[PDB]
UniProtKB/Swiss-Prot annotation:
Receptor for adenosine. The activity of this receptor is mediated by G proteins which activate adenylyl cyclase. The chain crosses the membrane at residues 9-33, 44-67, 79-101, 122-144, 175-199, 317-340, 349-372. Adenosine binds at E170, N335, S359, H360. One of its GO terms (biological process) is response to xenobiotic stimulus. This is Adenosine receptor A2a. GO terms for molecular function: alpha-actinin binding; calmodulin binding; enzyme binding; G protein-coupled adenosine receptor activity; identical protein binding; lipid binding; protein-containing complex binding; type 5 metabotropic glutamate receptor binding. Residues 3-8, 68-78, 145-174, 341-348 are extracellular. Ubiquitinated. Deubiquitinated by USP4; leading to stabilization and expression at the cell surface. Belongs to the G-protein coupled receptor 1 family. GO terms for cellular component: asymmetric synapse; axolemma; dendrite; glutamatergic synapse; intermediate filament; membrane; neuronal cell body; plasma membrane.
Length: 389
């Protein structure tokens, strides 16, 4: 069948994807720009990721359409339009890895996050990652390419000029680069590192939540021990365990006030215990319950609510990392079959184009994930569209 027919379908789908990638990710950038509640280090990497996806629509998809025609081109010019998308994919990987690491720092050492993770450092890291993305993605332009071995019969059949080749991705980009360097080293390894970071994030969240409820249980258990104690020494033992835990749990004004009352009331009871005044110590310790109800439970619940939101933000980020993998793995896997199985028939052209458009679909999906999973984005999206569009 005439190639322009299947080409028309491929090109039309690509153009549709390009429109959606531009519109959705422009909206992401506009939201971060407009809403100061969205201006944090995490979302600067989100913006860098949206910028890469905007350039997929503006440049990479037009380049992909061009290289599907096999037009006559100087080989290194053909190389650039083939490889530019690798720059954008690599930048996306760096942004996704940075987002994961940022969220791990926030959950594991929240006390030093704001001093460690600053806007100026994020902007410098983003700049560095874009430079490294060009070096990685344009590495074929430094000489790891097939321009030295042009397909002269294909060039002559298409009427190409001297020094020109039919511009086709797999004719100019070496497959060993795509499999060993681009896929294994530059894509697979960072994605696996991301998985490890997310596993540590969720394990850290689970441990901290367990410790909060466990510390609550230890506090309440020890009150019962004091109540049903029969000498002052048993009261002393339990209060000593309560006092060390209270100082451990203190590590905002009513928060500090609540713990000041709590530690003071424990010291009050411990002093009576050490005088052998059991009944007064048990009565003194009952006062702790008023402090527990008015203060400690509010701190516990707020700490629980903060940790659960951190789980929610890490899950949303992990979904976006997983969707990148889901959209890009088929094309990489196909390249692995082409490279490792020369006895296998090449994947058919229709499947090649399905795998290409699928990888381009990833530049559409993140704005939807933010809208459905992050209220602050969803509300900002609403105000921008309603008050303008
Ligand atoms: C800043 C942005 C908007 C500029 C975009 C520039 C792009 C479209 C330009 C820059 C380099 C250009 C390529 C440079 C060399 C060649 C080899 C020639 O035989 C065919 C055209 C081709 C393949 C060009 C296509 C267009 C190209 C990719
Ligand atoms: C969830 C995602 C990551 C899974 C992706 C699996 C896809 C990419 C796999 C599953 C089955 C695979 C195909 C199985 C058999 C062949 C025949 C061979 O002559 C060319 C490759 C080809 C056509 C494979 C291409 C890649 C393929 C389509
Ligand atoms: C964590 C996971 C997603 C890592 C990615 C899995 C990749 C590297 C695996 C999954 C399926 C694998 C392919 C399965 C079968 C064949 C056919 C064989 O004749 C050559 C190797 C080849 C082509 C494998 C190459 C590697 C491969 C593509
Ligand atoms: C992830 C990077 N990457 C690729 O690895 C890739 N590999 C191909 C090959 C396509 C093709 C193969 C055989 C053909 O005809 C026998 C053919 O005719 C038009 C096309 N395109 C790729 N693209 C998009 C530019 C990409 O972006
Ligand atoms: C994760 C990253 C991948 C780590 C392991 C990658 C190891 C791949 C090496 C291989 O199978 O090469 C054999 C050749 O002789 C085939 O031609
Ligand atoms: C708006 C549209 C971009 C139009 C894209 C123009 C590119 C069409 C060239 C073409 O169809 O050729 C494909 C190949 O040669 C086999 O059909
Ligand atoms: C705001 C965005 C600014 C604009 C962003 C850039 C626009 C992208 C358009 C096209 C890439 C395709 C260009 C490659 C076309 C090559 C066709 C060609 O040169 O064929 C001649 C002949 O084959 C040689 O001998
Ligand atoms: C070809 C490369 C094109 C663009 C890079 C665009 C990167 C997008 C810039 C995002 C950085 C950001 O939004 O944060 C900076 C801010 O100054 C922190 O305080
Ligand atoms: C993703 C959205 C839907 C994708 C649908 C098909 C994309 C292109 C696959 C078929 C292109 C033409 C096949 C051919 O004749 O070579
Ligand atoms: C909706 C998308 C409009 C895309 C139509 C232009 C592509 C036609 C393919 C072609 O004729 O080469
Ligand atoms: C897919 C993306 C949906 C985009 C909805 C259109 C509104 C955003 C466009 C814009 O703000 O410029
Ligand atoms: C093509 C790439 C298009 C990028 C789209 C993202 C633009 C987002 C806004 C950045 C600059 C905003 C300046 C507009 C006016 C500022 C204001 O009124 O507050
Ligand atoms: C080409 C793609 C252009 C996008 C550059 C980034 C656009 C918005 C960045 C500044 C606004 C913000 O801080 O969110
Ligand atoms: C602001 C948007 C920037 C992109 C504008 C261009 C939109 C995409 C247009 C078509 C891609 C180029 C197709 C050229 C195919 C060349 C085939 C040939 O010369 O034989
Ligand atoms: C920015 C984009 C590229 C700058 C100019 C690149 C031209 C060199 C490759 C074309 C060629 O020599 O065949
Ligand atoms: C080789 C590298 C060639 C030039 C590529 C570097 C482009 C850097 C683009 C801008 C960085 C934006 C982050 C700034 C905050
Ligand atoms: C090579 C790594 C990229 C270094 C150049 C980017 C500037 C560094 C910076 O912005 O702090
Ligand atoms: C990262 C650095 C990119 C180097 C790209 C240089 C482009 C030169 C094209 C080679 C040529 O003209 O023969
Ligand atoms: C594939 C090419 C790989 C290139 C490896 C060498 C480039 C690495 C360069 C340095 C990365 C960090 C740069 C630090 C910038 C300055 C820091 C600062 O001034 O505070
Ligand atoms: C500076 C970082 C790398 C140097 C890039 C310049 C190499 C030029 C492209 C190679 C070529 O012309 O064939
Ligand atoms: C190859 C690994 C696939 C999963 C990568 C995504 C990382 C986030 C997972 C949760
Ligand atoms: C995760 C780690 C992924 C690495 C997977 C192994 C790929 C090995 C492919 C080797 C196939 C060799 C084919 C042959 O012997 O001809
Ligand atoms: C997640 C990653 C899933 C990887 C998908 C692997 C799918 C099945 C591999 C089947 C291999 C096909 C052998 C073809 C034999 C032949 O063509 O001669
Ligand atoms: C979704 C449609 C494609 C899904 C994978 C099925 C396996 C590949 C499809 C047929 C190609 C096999 C072949 O003819 O070599
Ligand atoms: C979207 C789901 C798959 C779309 C498949 C596109 C092409 C179907 C097979 C084409 C063919 O057999 O020639
Ligand atoms: C052309 C096909 C475009 C598909 C990309 C659409 C992230 C999914 C939106 C669902 C709500
Ligand atoms: C590739 C796109 C696959 C489906 C993801 C769509 C999710 C957007 C709505 C939530
Ligand atoms: Na991307």
């Amino acid at each position: 069948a005439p190639p322009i027919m299947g080409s028309s379908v491929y090109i039309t789908v690509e153009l549709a994807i390009a429109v959606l990638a531009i519109l959705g990710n422009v909206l992401v950038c506009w939201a971060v720009w407009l809403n100061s509640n969205l201006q944090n280090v995490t979302n600067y990497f989100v913006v860098s990721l949206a910028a890469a996806d905007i350039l997929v629509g503006v440049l990479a998809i037009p380049f992909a359409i061009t290289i599907s025609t096999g037009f006559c081109a100087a080989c290194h010019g053909c190389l650039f339009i083939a490889c530019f998308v690798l720059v954008l994919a690599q930048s996306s990987i760096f942004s996704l890895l940075a987002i994961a690491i940022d969220r791990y720092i926030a959950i594991a050492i929240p006390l030093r996050y704001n001093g460690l993770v600053t806007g100026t450092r994020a902007a410098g890291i983003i700049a560095i990652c874009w430079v490294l993305s060009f070096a990685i993605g344009l590495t074929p332009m430094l000489g790891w390419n097939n321009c030295g071995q042009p397909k002269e019969g294909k060039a002559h059949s298409q009427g190409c000029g001297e020094g020109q080749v039919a511009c086709l991705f797999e004719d100019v980009v070496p497959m060993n680069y795509m499999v060993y360097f681009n896929f294994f080293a530059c894509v697979l390894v960072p994605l696996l590192l991301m998985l490890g970071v997310y596993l540590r994030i969720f394990a850290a969240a689970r441990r901290q939540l367990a410790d909060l409820e466990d510390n609550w249980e230890t506090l309440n258990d020890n009150l019962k021990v004091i109540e049903k104690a029969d000498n002052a020494a048993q009261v002393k033992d339990a209060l000593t365990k309560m006092r060390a835990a209270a100082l451990d749990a203190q590590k905002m004004k009513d928060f500090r006030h609540g713990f000041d009352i709590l530690v003071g009331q424990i010291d009050d009871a411990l002093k009576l215990a050490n005088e052998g005044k059991v009944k007064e110590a048990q009565a003194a310790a009952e006062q702790l319950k008023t402090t527990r109800n008015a203060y400690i439970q509010k701190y516990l619940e707020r700490a629980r609510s903060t940790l659960q939101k951190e789980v929610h933000a890490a899950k949303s980020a992990a979904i976006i990392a997983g969707l990148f993998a889901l959209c890009w793995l088929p094309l990489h896997i196909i390249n692995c079959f082409t490279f490792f199985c020369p006895d296998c028939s090449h994947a058919p052209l229709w499947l090649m184009y399905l795998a290409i458009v699928l990888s381009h679909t990833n530049s559409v999906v993140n704005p939807f994930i933010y809208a459905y999973r992050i209220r602050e984005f969803r509300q900002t999206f609403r105000k921008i569209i309603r008050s303008h569009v």
